[PDB]
Scaffold this motif. Structure first.
Motif, PDB file in Angstrom:
ATOM      1  N   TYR A   5       0.825  -1.205   0.000  1.00  0.00           N
ATOM      2  CA  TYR A   5       0.000   0.000   0.000  1.00  0.00           C
ATOM      3  C   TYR A   5       0.862   1.259   0.000  1.00  0.00           C
ATOM      4  O   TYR A   5       0.571   2.228  -0.718  1.00  0.00           O
ATOM      5  CB  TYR A   5      -0.935  -0.029   1.209  1.00  0.00           C
ATOM      6  CG  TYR A   5      -1.759   1.218   1.421  1.00  0.00           C
ATOM      7  CD1 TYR A   5      -2.987   1.375   0.796  1.00  0.00           C
ATOM      8  CD2 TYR A   5      -1.326   2.222   2.274  1.00  0.00           C
ATOM      9  CE1 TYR A   5      -3.750   2.505   0.996  1.00  0.00           C
ATOM     10  CE2 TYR A   5      -2.083   3.356   2.482  1.00  0.00           C
ATOM     11  CZ  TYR A   5      -3.293   3.492   1.840  1.00  0.00           C
ATOM     12  OH  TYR A   5      -4.049   4.623   2.045  1.00  0.00           O
ATOM     13  N   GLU A   6       1.934   1.259   0.795  1.00  0.00           N
ATOM     14  CA  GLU A   6       2.834   2.409   0.821  1.00  0.00           C
ATOM     15  C   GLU A   6       3.494   2.624  -0.535  1.00  0.00           C
ATOM     16  O   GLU A   6       3.634   3.765  -0.989  1.00  0.00           O
ATOM     17  CB  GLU A   6       3.893   2.228   1.908  1.00  0.00           C
ATOM     18  CG  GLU A   6       3.349   2.157   3.330  1.00  0.00           C
ATOM     19  CD  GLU A   6       2.895   3.501   3.876  1.00  0.00           C
ATOM     20  OE1 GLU A   6       2.703   4.452   3.089  1.00  0.00           O
ATOM     21  OE2 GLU A   6       2.729   3.607   5.109  1.00  0.00           O
ATOM     22  N   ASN A   7       3.913   1.541  -1.192  1.00  0.00           N
ATOM     23  CA  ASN A   7       4.503   1.679  -2.522  1.00  0.00           C
ATOM     24  C   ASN A   7       3.488   2.218  -3.521  1.00  0.00           C
ATOM     25  O   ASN A   7       3.830   3.033  -4.392  1.00  0.00           O
ATOM     26  CB  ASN A   7       5.063   0.340  -2.994  1.00  0.00           C
ATOM     27  CG  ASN A   7       6.552   0.222  -2.763  1.00  0.00           C
ATOM     28  OD1 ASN A   7       7.153   1.053  -2.083  1.00  0.00           O
ATOM     29  ND2 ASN A   7       7.161  -0.811  -3.333  1.00  0.00           N
ATOM     30  N   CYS A   8       2.238   1.764  -3.419  1.00  0.00           N
ATOM     31  CA  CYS A   8       1.186   2.278  -4.289  1.00  0.00           C
ATOM     32  C   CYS A   8       1.043   3.781  -4.117  1.00  0.00           C
ATOM     33  O   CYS A   8       0.932   4.526  -5.097  1.00  0.00           O
ATOM     34  CB  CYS A   8      -0.138   1.570  -3.984  1.00  0.00           C
ATOM     35  SG  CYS A   8      -1.648   2.348  -4.653  1.00  0.00           S
ATOM     36  N   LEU A   9       1.033   4.245  -2.865  1.00  0.00           N
ATOM     37  CA  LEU A   9       0.940   5.682  -2.620  1.00  0.00           C
ATOM     38  C   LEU A   9       2.153   6.419  -3.176  1.00  0.00           C
ATOM     39  O   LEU A   9       2.016   7.488  -3.786  1.00  0.00           O
ATOM     40  CB  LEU A   9       0.796   5.957  -1.125  1.00  0.00           C
ATOM     41  CG  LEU A   9      -0.624   5.907  -0.565  1.00  0.00           C
ATOM     42  CD1 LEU A   9      -0.608   6.142   0.934  1.00  0.00           C
ATOM     43  CD2 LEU A   9      -1.507   6.924  -1.263  1.00  0.00           C
ATOM     44  N   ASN A  47      -2.584  14.895   2.748  1.00  0.00           N
ATOM     45  CA  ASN A  47      -3.245  15.908   1.938  1.00  0.00           C
ATOM     46  C   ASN A  47      -3.406  15.493   0.482  1.00  0.00           C
ATOM     47  O   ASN A  47      -3.536  16.364  -0.385  1.00  0.00           O
ATOM     48  CB  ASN A  47      -2.475  17.228   2.022  1.00  0.00           C
ATOM     49  CG  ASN A  47      -1.099  17.140   1.394  1.00  0.00           C
ATOM     50  OD1 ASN A  47      -0.514  16.063   1.304  1.00  0.00           O
ATOM     51  ND2 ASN A  47      -0.575  18.279   0.955  1.00  0.00           N
ATOM     52  N   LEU A  48      -3.408  14.190   0.195  1.00  0.00           N
ATOM     53  CA  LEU A  48      -3.469  13.733  -1.189  1.00  0.00           C
ATOM     54  C   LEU A  48      -4.769  14.157  -1.862  1.00  0.00           C
ATOM     55  O   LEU A  48      -4.763  14.643  -2.997  1.00  0.00           O
ATOM     56  CB  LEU A  48      -3.309  12.216  -1.245  1.00  0.00           C
ATOM     57  CG  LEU A  48      -2.606  11.675  -2.490  1.00  0.00           C
ATOM     58  CD1 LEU A  48      -1.153  12.105  -2.502  1.00  0.00           C
ATOM     59  CD2 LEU A  48      -2.723  10.163  -2.557  1.00  0.00           C
ATOM     60  N   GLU A  49      -5.898  13.977  -1.173  1.00  0.00           N
ATOM     61  CA  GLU A  49      -7.190  14.279  -1.785  1.00  0.00           C
ATOM     62  C   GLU A  49      -7.356  15.773  -2.034  1.00  0.00           C
ATOM     63  O   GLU A  49      -7.869  16.181  -3.084  1.00  0.00           O
ATOM     64  CB  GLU A  49      -8.322  13.753  -0.904  1.00  0.00           C
ATOM     65  CG  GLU A  49      -8.175  12.294  -0.509  1.00  0.00           C
ATOM     66  CD  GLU A  49      -7.600  11.442  -1.624  1.00  0.00           C
ATOM     67  OE1 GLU A  49      -8.269  11.295  -2.668  1.00  0.00           O
ATOM     68  OE2 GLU A  49      -6.477  10.923  -1.457  1.00  0.00           O
ATOM     69  N   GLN A  50      -6.937  16.604  -1.077  1.00  0.00           N
ATOM     70  CA  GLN A  50      -7.066  18.046  -1.246  1.00  0.00           C
ATOM     71  C   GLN A  50      -6.233  18.534  -2.425  1.00  0.00           C
ATOM     72  O   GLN A  50      -6.707  19.336  -3.240  1.00  0.00           O
ATOM     73  CB  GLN A  50      -6.663  18.762   0.044  1.00  0.00           C
ATOM     74  CG  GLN A  50      -5.817  20.011  -0.149  1.00  0.00           C
ATOM     75  CD  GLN A  50      -6.621  21.188  -0.664  1.00  0.00           C
ATOM     76  OE1 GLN A  50      -7.744  21.427  -0.221  1.00  0.00           O
ATOM     77  NE2 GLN A  50      -6.051  21.927  -1.608  1.00  0.00           N
TER      78      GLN A  50
END
Lengths: 48, 51
Positions: free
Chosen positions: B19-23, B45-48
């Motif tokens: 999951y961390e690598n995906c991010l 703050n990825l979505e913002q």
């Protein structure tokens, strides 16, 4: 107020001549070309 | 039960790492595309920033 229509009326025949002469051309320009872009190298640095 | 505990701990660790690598991959792609300052774009703050 200052009017630009007189100048257009003066240069109308030349405008028509250019439009006749510009059929096989691309009016305008792109703000990305440069005489040094073909031999340049891009660098990318990520300190963190 | 003990064996299931031992196995699923490592399984959860592996899932978290993936999951961390995906991010990280998405963050790097966005940063490279939009030339944003490094480290500024975080997971919180990825979505913002996306919006």
């Amino acid at each position: 107020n200052m009017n630009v229509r007189p100048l257009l009326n003066y240069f109308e025949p030349l405008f028509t001549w250019l439009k006749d002469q510009n059929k096989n051309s691309f009016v305008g320009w792109s703000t990305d070309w440069s005489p040094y872009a073909d031999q340049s190298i891009k660098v990318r640095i990520s300190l963190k | 039960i003990f064996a299931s505990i031992v196995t699923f701990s490592i399984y959860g660790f592996k899932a978290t790492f993936n999951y961390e690598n995906c991010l990280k991959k998405v963050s790097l792609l966005l940063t490279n595309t939009f030339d944003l300052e490094d480290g500024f774009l975080t997971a919180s703050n990825l979505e913002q920033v996306k919006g």
